Amino acid sequence: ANSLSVHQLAAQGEMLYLATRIEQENVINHTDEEGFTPLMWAAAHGQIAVVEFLLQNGADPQLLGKGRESALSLACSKGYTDIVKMLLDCGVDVNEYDWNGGTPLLYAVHGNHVKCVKMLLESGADPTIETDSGYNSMDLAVALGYRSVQQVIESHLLKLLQN
């Protein structure tokens, strides 16, 4: 563990060493080479308990990576619903793009993560915003053949129009 960074501890879900390394030094929001916080590493590897612990101890969920990667997008991309809910409850932006033109919703749709798609839409993610190529989240779900996802999105759009 001496060899492991705080990021790696968070990724592995090593709560004990992680908690110790935080007392030793104020490193809770210390970014690695790519701008990733311990929280982003934890979110990316689905470590719910570590995410809870870091957020309780002041980890900032709005900090972004070098390419504007977010903890939210990392979690969405892998379908870690419980982590998505925790971050959303912190009031992060749900509609922001990174440099690779991805948004949380596009990553959820790309990974066929239906519960994540539903949760994002309920928190204000807009399925009509487009990539630089002109396609939106509905388009992508159709393109990829993810029918349960297409239906969640369409149902959402329809209910907006039906009030």
């Binding site: 991309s77 690779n100 033109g101 990553y107 396609y135 992508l140």
Partner: peptide, 13 residues
């Protein structure tokens, strides 16, 4: 690796 996000399509369609 640093965790990474998947590459999305540059066009669909």
């Amino acid at each position: 690796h640093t965790p990474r996000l998947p590459t999305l399509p540059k066009r669909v369609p």
